[PDB]
Amino acid sequence: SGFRKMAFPSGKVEGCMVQVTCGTTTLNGLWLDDVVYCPRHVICTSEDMLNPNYEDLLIRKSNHNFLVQAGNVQLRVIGHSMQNCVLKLKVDTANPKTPKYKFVRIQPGQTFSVLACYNGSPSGVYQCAMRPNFTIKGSFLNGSCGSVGFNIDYDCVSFCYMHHMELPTGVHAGTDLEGNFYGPFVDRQTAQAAGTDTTITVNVLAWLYAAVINGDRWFLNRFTTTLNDFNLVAMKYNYEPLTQDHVDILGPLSAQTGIAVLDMCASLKELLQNGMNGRTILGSALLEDEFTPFDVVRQCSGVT
Amino acid sequence: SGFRKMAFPSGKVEGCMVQVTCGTTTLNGLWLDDVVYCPRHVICTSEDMLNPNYEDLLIRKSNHNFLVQAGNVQLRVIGHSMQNCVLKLKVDTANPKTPKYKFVRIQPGQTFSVLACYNGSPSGVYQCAMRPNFTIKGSFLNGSCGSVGFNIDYDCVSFCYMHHMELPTGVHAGTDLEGNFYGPFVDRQTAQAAGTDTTITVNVLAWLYAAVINGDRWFLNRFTTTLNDFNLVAMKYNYEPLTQDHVDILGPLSAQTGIAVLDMCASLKELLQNGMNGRTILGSALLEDEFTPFDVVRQCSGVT
Ligand SMILES: Cc1ccncc1NC(=O)Cc1cc(Cl)cc(O[C@@H]2CC(=O)N2)c1
Ligand SMILES: Cc1ccncc1NC(=O)Cc1cc(Cl)cc(O[C@@H]2CC(=O)N2)c1
């Protein structure tokens, strides 16, 4: 029993973190096989960030200008290329610590662990969700660019995020490992605003199932609702519309607790309309939406 | 910017997790040098847990009855001894992955990362605090016994916790790596209750400093207070009495924000007396007490 915002063990990812320096700028790179991936804004000076032409900027750069350092050893760069917003630095040595890996583009609402790094050194690990507005509410400072987001399936690490920038709102934006930004963000120091961030309804419900499994049942009521009636309430509170696919994904949790999804929706409806009344759920005074139904099942069953 | 319940990177600890089996029971062990540490209740059957005499139970056990497995390889046990509530199984092979390590007994209010494990395999990592009542609000299931709590100082891992049991209240209890339980708990399946759990005032204040550093300043008021006046309020709300040592430890955070500790105490006083009024602080609707002043400084500065 107990329910925590749990991250994946970070060891397989620590063994991939490297430091990439280009002139004055130092950020993190991800070393898998003989390639180091990092944000392409490593080649920019503070003046270049206002309106960078990365193709022109990369032309004034050669393999020897990219300093890659893994621990205390220098990696020799034999190739460089830009793929969307990431630079791929081909090095002469394959990472002996490269785990089984995949590059995946995650969906909004899905979760992942972040290994925050500075100077190619991991400082901490936390669990995040890709927000419906394609931002992440992370914890990153200057130097954290190149820090990655990932998931682990037994021995396979799926890299899903690379940190590039913080918006003036304090939320974070970045790319998949192919350099494509999540959301409308561009790697340029210009006013960029994150759209309306909605609450991931299927995740809140999964967390309400986690609460029931862990003894917190005060919010369970004698009511039920329908998908349409619940969604009228969800829209009012800027919650993602619940679909039959979401009801389906909640299925295993509904089967374990014996509480129909629409019955849980009715509890959520009353919690939205009436608030918590000073009460808590899993030690939280607000509705948590950063646990997918998969995270709940795996934490509440014990998947290693 | 951004503030998350961040855990230490777990790689150095994953390289130490092993599986210890004794008859029917399987739990986790910690392999450092040629010694595997695990909870001594691994030798108990379900009938033994009601009133175990570990000295007598250990006498019916020989080195060959303790199955230690690191990954897919079996470790040969050449010695066994009980040190308080932990068994130390001397193996013939030193862990080639043993990091620089220390065994420390942490103080209540201090934080640490937990690497939850099952069958010697890490499943997740989260940040915890040793509660003033010496319990931890963790996330552990059956098989998680032997999972450890730790801190990292650059390259040195300080092991501070080994998970042993869950209380009927859903909170967790365990020992330091010398087998001494934190709190009055005994490793016996008998009704054990955790005393009153108070809020770690110095940690809430440190988190209020983290909030100010990250833009959340709504709670800052035009008032001040004294240590004695604040502590009258803290006692009412089951908060730890704030001492001059706590004021001292808050010093670097007070210097960064330019907000005197007693001014922050006055904001906390009003938040305790009036609540949040539907507002949030660092995305939380309640006062968070699981970040020490050290955690705040290190997260808000970027210590790797
Ligand atoms: C300092 C820090 C803290 C946490 N995480 C990241 C950083 N770094 C940056 O954000 C630097 C940067 C890189 C790019 Cl590619 C674009 C930038 O401008 C965006 C546009 C907008 O809004 N801000 C800024
Ligand atoms: C099942 C599980 C889930 C999470 N973490 C741990 C466990 N395991 C246990 O708790 C087994 C156990 C070991 C001991 Cl040494 C004493 C025990 O009785 C205490 C006394 C009281 O209260 N409960 C029970």
Curated annotation (Swiss-Prot), chains A, B:
It is found in: Host cytoplasm; Host Golgi apparatus; Host nucleus. Changing M49A: Does not affect ability to cleave and inactivate human TRMT1. Changing L205V: In strain: Zeta/P.2. Residues 1-304 are cytoplasmic. Changing C145A: Complete loss of 3C-like proteinase nsp5 cleavage. It comes from the Viruses. There is a cross-link at K5, K90 (Glycyl lysine isopeptide (Lys-Gly) (interchain with G-Cter in ubiquitin)). Residues 1-304 form the Peptidase C30 domain. It catalyses: TSAVLQ-|-SGFRK-NH2 and SGVTFQ-|-GKFKK the two peptides corresponding to the two self-cleavage sites of the SARS 3C-like proteinase are the two most reactive peptide substrates. The enzyme exhibits a strong preference for substrates containing Gln at P1 position and Leu at P2 position. The active site is at H41, C145. Inhibited by pyridone-containing alpha-ketoamides compounds 13a and 13b. In turn, alpha-ketoamide 13b (tert-butyl (1-((S)-1-(((S)-4-(benzylamino)-3,4-dioxo-1-((S)-2-oxopyrrolidin-3-yl)butan-2-yl)amino)-3-cyclopropyl-1-oxopropan-2-yl)-2-oxo-1,2-dihydropyridin-3-yl)carbamate) inhibits SARS-CoV-2 replication in human lung cells. Inhibited ex vivo by michael acceptor inhibitor N3. Inhibited ex vivo by compound 11a and 11b. 3CL-PRO exists as monomer and homodimer. Only the homodimer shows catalytic activity. Interacts with host FBXO22; this interaction promotes the proteasomal degradation of nsp5. Cleaves the C-terminus of replicase polyprotein at 11 sites. Recognizes substrates containing the core sequence [ILMVF]-Q-|-[SGACN]. Cleaves and inactivates human TRMT1, preventing tRNA guanine(26)-dimethylation of tRNAs. May cleave human NLRP1 in lung epithelial cells, thereby activating the NLRP1 inflammasome pathway. May cleave human GSDMD, triggering alternative GSDME-mediated epithelial cell death upon activation of the NLRP1 inflammasome, which may enhance the release interleukins 1B, 6, 16 and 18. Also able to bind an ADP-ribose-1''-phosphate (ADRP). This is 3C-like proteinase nsp5. It comes from Severe acute respiratory syndrome coronavirus 2 (2019-nCoV). The lineage of its organism: Viruses, Riboviria, Orthornavirae, Pisuviricota, Pisoniviricetes.
